[PDB]
Amino acid sequence: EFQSKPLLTKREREVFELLVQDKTTKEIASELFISEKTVRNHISNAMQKLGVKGRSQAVVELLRMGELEL
Amino acid sequence: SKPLLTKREREVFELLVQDKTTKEIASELFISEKTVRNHISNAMQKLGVKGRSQAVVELLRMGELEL
């Protein structure tokens, strides 16, 4: 309706939801049927969108924003 | 189940979730960057996880960190 689209794309969110369950990037790639490079690319793009340098800070910010659950 | 962090280990994570690099943490807590990495590693081992983000998520789960 009028709310803006989530900052994360669908696939970025899937990667992050696996990330918080302790999966390695190989396991995420295997689960999502994509290359590891693609997993890294998704993590990288999401952190450039949040303007943070590390995965920890991406997770925290995403959690603050309601874009990721736990 | 419930692993206990020392004062320093908790402090490092508390600073970590405020978007500080290890360099900055080292500066604020008046210790070396090596010592900061050591506290992080030892916390990760107590928590049974593989990286910093997983440590943060497990501490959030247990109620030992707040955002």
Cβ pairs bridging A and B (under 8 Å): 38
Q: Who among A22, A24, A57 is closest to B19 (CB)?
A: A57
Number of domains comprising chain B:
1
- Residue A18, CA distances (Å) to A63, B7, B27, B52, B65 in order: 14, 30, 33, 15, 21
CATH of the domain at A66: 1.10.10.10
Q: Who among A52, A53, A59 is closest to B56 (CB)?
A: A59
Count of alpha carbons within 13 angstroms of residue B51, beta-carbon side: 13
Report helix, strand and coil shares of chain A as percent, to nearest 5.
65, 0, 35
Tokens of B52: 């910093």
Could you list the residue range(s) of the whole structural domain that residue A16 is in? 1-70
Category of B48 on φ-ψ map: left (φ > 0), alpha (ψ -120 to 50) or beta: left
Tokens of A28: 């995420």
Scan for tokens 């247990």, then name that residue: B62
Q: What is the DSSP letter of B64?
A: S
Chain A nearest CA to B32, separation (Å): 20
Scan for tokens 């790639």, then name that residue: A29
- Asked if residue B17 lies in contact with residue A57, where contact means CB atoms within 8 angstroms, the answer is yes
Angle B26-B28-B32 from CA coordinates, rounded to 5°: 20
